[PDB]
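Worked example 4.2. Below are the chains of a multi-component assembly; read each line carefully before continuing.
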Amino acid sequence: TAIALDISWSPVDEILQIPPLSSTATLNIKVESGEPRGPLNHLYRELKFLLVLADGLRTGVTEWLEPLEAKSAVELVQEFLNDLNKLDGFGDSTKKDTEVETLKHDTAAVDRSVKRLFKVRSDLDFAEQLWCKMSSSVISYQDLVKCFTLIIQSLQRGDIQPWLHSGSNSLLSKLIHQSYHGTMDTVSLSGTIPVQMLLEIGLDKLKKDYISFFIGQELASLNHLEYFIAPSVDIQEQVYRVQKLHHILEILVSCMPFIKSQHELLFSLTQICIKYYKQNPLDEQHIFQLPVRPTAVKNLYQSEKPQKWRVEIYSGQKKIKTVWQLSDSSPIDHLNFHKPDFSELTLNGSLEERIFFTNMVTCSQVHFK
Amino acid sequence: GPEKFSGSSWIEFLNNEDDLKDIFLQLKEGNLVCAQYLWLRHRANFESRFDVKMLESLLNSMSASVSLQKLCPWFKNDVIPFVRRTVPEGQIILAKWLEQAARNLELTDKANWPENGLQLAEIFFTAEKTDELGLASSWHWISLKDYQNTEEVCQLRTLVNNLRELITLHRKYNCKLALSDFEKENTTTIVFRMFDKVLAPELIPSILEKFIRVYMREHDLQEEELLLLYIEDLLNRCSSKSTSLFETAWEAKAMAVIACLSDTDLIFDAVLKIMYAAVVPWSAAVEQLVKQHLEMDHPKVKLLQESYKLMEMKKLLRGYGIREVNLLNKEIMRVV
Amino acid sequence: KLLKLTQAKSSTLINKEITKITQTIESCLLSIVNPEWAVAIAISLAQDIPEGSFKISALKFCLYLAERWLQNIPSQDEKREKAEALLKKLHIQYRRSGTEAVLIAHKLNTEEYLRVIGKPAHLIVSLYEHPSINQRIQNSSGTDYPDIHAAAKEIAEVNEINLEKVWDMLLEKWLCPSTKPGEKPSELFELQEDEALRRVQYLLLSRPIDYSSRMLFVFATSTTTTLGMHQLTFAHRTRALQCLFYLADKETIESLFKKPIEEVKSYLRCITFLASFETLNIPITYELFCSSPKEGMIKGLWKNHSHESMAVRLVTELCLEYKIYDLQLWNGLLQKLLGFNMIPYLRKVLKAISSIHSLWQVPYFSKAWQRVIQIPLLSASCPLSPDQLSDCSESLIAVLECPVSGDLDLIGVARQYIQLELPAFALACLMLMPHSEKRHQQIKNFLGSCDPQVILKQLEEHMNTGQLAGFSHQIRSLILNNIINKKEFGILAKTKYFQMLKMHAMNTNNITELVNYLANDLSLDEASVLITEYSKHCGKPVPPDTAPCEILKMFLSGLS
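Applying the procedure described above to all three chains together yields the following structure tokens:
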């Protein structure tokens, strides 16, 4: 994930000057796969668990993840059913949960500001609450069978009325609906069917979590997300489009601390990312080039030294040019000039020595007649 | 300007012949004034070369970062009329982009939305039709409707009408919805939503008379049948998903609608439908309603007492752990 | 319930109750052994029933009971005639009620339409003359309009009259009008402004395009109609072909003529010209075009027919399409158009030929621009109507669209605008001169005699709309730069433009005099905020919480 601002201006008024606001600034953003160091970690981990199931359905081999909790999946399902049965009758047990929260540093303020935009939705149904407990402590194929058998028993006994959300892409919601209409047939759990029934819930959960942010932050509309949430494609391509949406999320979060001031920049970046993945597959090596206003990001390059500063003096065409460039790093990919060996040299409170690399691109014009 | 004058730029601009490249560069710069001036100074230059691909390039160089106050007048008199007079075949994409652009105003703006959205969406239809200048030789000067009745233009017209009715709802009826919400509902559901925006039961009849009945009589709609259907939908949205029996928001909203009814036949059966959806036993307000409706006389009060003893046997069955309603015939002996 | 039906907005709840009650009544009536009593009771019951589909059903049941009574009446009794005279009365009532229901369903409750129910053909003729038919083709915003096709068809079905005869009469009525004086050649050139063509196209919309296209093709080619023996004039052919261009697409038109769309357009031009000549009785026929390659016949037509205005127009419109651009021919053409005082047509012709280098050097070219620009300006006077202001804008556009506008007397046009109380329009013409020193002298002498605020208001109200938006900002830049150079900040200081006069100091870097005027002649707050905005714009922001005098001091030290 390299986010670098390239600023071009003409003419050059001073050597090594501060670029004015009349310059053209373009932000080149490359975003890698995965985000375990940001606020989306508890999403990506779940997505990674999804990546297991999306593969477990494809090949049948389920490489289970480590359980992040103490209890097993079946115990969580049993107590989740018991509490909801108490809510429906003989019960409505109430819990009190007070936990200590604190800040680490002033950057935690921005981290929390980004976290609340991807916070768990205030409205959760039966399926997403089941998935939340089933996205961290499922380590065997027998657990899925036991959990779905418990759900079947609860639905048949008519003990609970699960809370549901619109869209009902998962078959379990349809099973609940048919249980609302009397008694249903006995559901069989064979092959990769138990994997797929659980997979169908995480897709809806992640789609709702995405939509609560895109429309919630006015960064995308239903039409903008229609191509990615379209159920006309197979489930593997649905997971692939979820991957693309998560990569767009990673693109946006990596740039929120920088261009938060202007809503236009955050909206244009989101639209460019959406239009890219509408017609292109998932690409992490692609560098998105967003032209940004130098006025809004003028405080970011007035406090940073340039990695490379270049002056190019030419006449008419750019075939004949004289370039003087200064780079704090090596601009050569086949040579390395000798920096001082920092062994037995300065290893104290004094700063390390730095040798700046200056390169002069000259040429010789030959007239062909 | 004169302060940017230079020989290298002057000769380069003189050698430039594709006048559209400068306009595209200005559009990408967000400088609409210079783009309009370059359009004006070269009106007859690219007129003989106007086709679909250059218009697509113009729309692609067009970005969503400029003010519409200097753009809408430019579309109404300069861009859209020129497209209509020169290439009517380009009226599709020019509409389609606009169909997106107005929808983009749903996210770019919220204060002037959808008034700015309406005035940008209507700019295609409100553009002047070239019918007064005298030249019948270039028969494409008349904007034929063979390209105005296409699917994209029809959808854009439907969107314009939807924006008109949306402004009517925002200002007059005080029913504020999203564009996608209004794109998938009907008059009955709009009536339901006007009550949905209302939370206080006391103001339900006042607003009903104020705007909802006016909307009703403007489209030949029924009052009491729609009130009963609203009660049914309120029951369905709560009781069907009711995991916890504390969603009493439907009872308070339904009592006011019951008070709004004028037909005695449609009151008792509405209360029965409340009975047939509420979980046995009901709450305190519903208990007051039942005791009230037992007191007056009606031929359906016998049906109400039938439903009352139905509630009693449901209470017995659910106190003995049998929660199914109306076991058919064979499990009666087993229950006994 | 029937009385409540006449006032209720909706009927979905009363329809079922009325249906049950009417079914009970019908069951009571159908069990009567005597059918005469049943008829006498049903007719009385149906009379009290108000209008609607219920009235139609009641009349149908009365007809059924009359049929049952007729079956019980042998042909040797006097009750046969009494039953039949009543059966035809019930039929008259049925045909009245069926038409009334269709008329009400389409929101047609006028007394004239209700009176004409005994003449179904005349009622259908009146239906197809509805203004909404013209409105549908004029305005394209269709949301709610009465369907004439759905109304007339059902009215004819109820009245048991074939719609084919009525449609045949309607086709003859408008598409082939008789030789009565109401025709002018100006209306023939623009047939879209006619309500009859819209009605013909609307009538042809209902029937399939396959038959209508062939019928219009036969009208545009043959001398006799497909409806009778009446002769087909060239105006009828032009109207029929323009209907074909509106309904049929390119493929359908090309499938019939077996010609490219350009050839069909040329045939349309030829037949329009022939119709215009036939209206004024000019013996120019179709055989004048299908021979004698175009250069020679165009030159001969210009030689023989240089005295008629419409012959000059015929030569002009043929030279534009067939691409004959002789310099002397166009010198004659442009001069003769102004000889007939066709100033807007001459403007259109000049703007059509404003992209050819050969015609830019015609001796009448610059002469044609000058009079076309000035004549609408000379005819106009204060106050300015919207048409006159639009004509002034057209004259300014003609100044813009003219590539040799530097050869025109722009001081004269500017003074004409001055006589029109339009300083902004006068400055627009003054700015476009190719001479720099004279332009600078004239602008300095002009802007010192006109109020800049009024000029800017005129720029905002009219110059920023249409095609003049890009040049209005440049006129504004000239005006504000002159104001800054003349130390005339006080003129706009009391108005809303002073802040705008601030930002133009940003873009042109002409802030020194404005800052000096604000610091010396006005309050220091506006100077300090101005300098702070300037520093924020240039990338060297002044730190906040600074006194206005200190900010002025750094600004003064920043100018050295």
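Take a moment to check your reading of the output against the notes. Chain C has 32 helices and no strands. Chain C touches chain A through three residues (CB under 8 Å).
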